[PDB]
Design a protein around this ligand. Structure first.
Ligand code: NA
Ligand code: NA
Ligand code: NA
Lengths: 212, 228
């Protein structure tokens, strides 16, 4: 693997550079470094090849260079649409290619938001099937980093919790969800259950109780 | 118009093998190297190998040697990559890509010049067994039921593999629908939820049905979501 910074950030209009560090056997050996831009949901796109050359149709806001065992992709006129994962690949010696871990580009200045949290108790039907799931749905938060804790009555609960990583919504804020699995007896034998969602600036907690 | 046509998504048990095909069109198949790469979670872009479609000569990444085989059938312009002894590390999207032009005068097999990409093939490695979902209603609040708006939904529980799709009222209801990405549970099964916000003045008269499609198990359920 070639080593790339996990994350690079910039403001719109600004220039950012993404590094790609190899060894004497690969990056430093030849002028055979390429870069690819990946928007998840689409196949990666050819951006740069042979260190600094452009494939047809690619914007010249992206430029590539190399010094020693380190290749660099520079993005000028930074736009929000440049948010993507960027990967470098190189000739790796012994007729092989080696690629990098990727770099996530974040464009700064985007609208922040607190999470909206909706908590559903187990349905009557699920209980009647001798199962119970609490459903905690979390949306509209930015930046996309949240921690979700559950409580039974006023005490932390870790067993039976399943929580997703945040994923981007259509409006570029994030959504996540968390599920607490209980037996119907556990659901009914407690005062309350709570889903508490901590974001950078606030904690939002929703509670449900079997006595409705 | 170049297009690289890959075989469809596969679901495999640990220890099994997978073979993915790639049929490139829009140019002469034997004129360019074929490479296979993958995008795997927390490993980034990984190179599996190259194949010369003219000769069948190949080379594999050193971390794939002994468990990947690349071949081709020129008569149908199709390349194959087989990966053996699958584990969770192999859950990834696999791409066939075009590489450099093949010359008699110089070796360009190892040029990482991937101009054209296949649509990708998802392989999911899991010991889970195919299973349709249980669908439970997420009833609107007793309290939100009062003019205004209410959130209601469907809990699509314990299915495998992905994907499920959810529509509401046969797609006649789209405004305010949010279907959340599934969670992969410790059991190896997925659950997801889909919620729609409707005017609370509407609850009880207007019928809300979530249409859950789980093609991998050939099941569809249309679930009515009612107050209470
Ligand atoms: Na090199
Ligand atoms: Na949002
Ligand atoms: Na109850």
């Amino acid at each position: 693997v070639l080593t790339q910074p996990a994350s690079v950030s910039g403001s719109p209009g600004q220039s950012i550079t993404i590094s790609c560090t190899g060894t004497i056997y690969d990056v430093g050996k030849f002028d055979l470094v390429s870069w690819y831009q990946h928007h998840p949901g689409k196949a990666p796109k050819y951006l740069i090849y042979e260190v600094k050359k452009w494939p047809s149709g690619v914007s010249h806001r992206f430029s590539g260079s190399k010094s020693g065992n380190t290749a660099s992709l520079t993005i000028s006129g930074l736009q929000v649409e440049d948010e993507a994962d960027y990967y470098c690949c190189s000739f790796g010696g012994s007729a092989a290619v080696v690629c990098g871990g990727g770099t996530k580009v974040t464009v700064l200045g985007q609208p922040k938001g607190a999470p909206s949290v909706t908590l559903f108790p187990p349905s009557s039907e699920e209980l009647q099937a001798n199962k119970a799931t609490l459903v905690c749905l979390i949306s509209d938060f930015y930046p996309g980093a949240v921690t979700v804790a559950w409580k039974a009555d006023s005490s932390p609960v870790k067993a039976g919790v399943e929580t997703t990583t945040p994923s981007k919504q259509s409006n570029n804020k994030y959504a996540a969800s968390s599920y607490l699995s209980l037996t119907p007896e556990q659901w009914k034998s407690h005062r309350s259950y709570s889903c508490q969602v901590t974001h950078e600036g606030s904690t939002v907690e929703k509670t449900v109780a079997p006595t409705e | 118009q170049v297009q690289l046509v890959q075989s469809g998504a596969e679901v495999k048990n640990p220890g099994a093998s997978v073979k993915v095909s790639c049929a490139p069109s829009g140019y002469t198949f034997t004129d360019f190297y074929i490479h296979w790469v993958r995008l795997a979670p927390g490993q980034g872009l990984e190179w599996l190998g190259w194949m010369n479609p003219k000769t069948g000569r190949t080379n594999q990444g050193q971390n794939f040697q002994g468990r990947v085989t690349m071949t081709r059938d020129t008569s149908i312009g199709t390349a194959y990559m087989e990966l053996r002894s699958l584990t969770s590390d192999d859950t990834a999207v696999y791409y066939c890509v075009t590489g450099a032009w093949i010359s008699d005068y110089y070796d360009s097999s190892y040029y990482p010049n991937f101009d054209h990409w296949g649509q990708g093939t998802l392989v999911t490695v899991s010991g889970a067994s195919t299973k349709g979902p249980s669908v439970f209603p997420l009833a609107p609040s007793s309290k939100s039921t009062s003019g205004g708006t209410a959130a209601l939904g469907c809990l699509v529980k314990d299915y495998f593999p992905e994907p499920v799709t959810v529509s509401w009222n046969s797609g006649a209801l789209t405004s305010g629908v949010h279907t959340f990405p599934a969670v992969l549970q410790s059991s190896g099964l997925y659950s997801l939820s889909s919620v729609v916000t409707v005017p609370s003045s509407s609850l009880g008269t207007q019928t809300y049905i979530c249409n859950v499609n789980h093609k991998p198990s050939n099941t569809k359920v249309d679930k009515r979501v009612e107050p209470k």
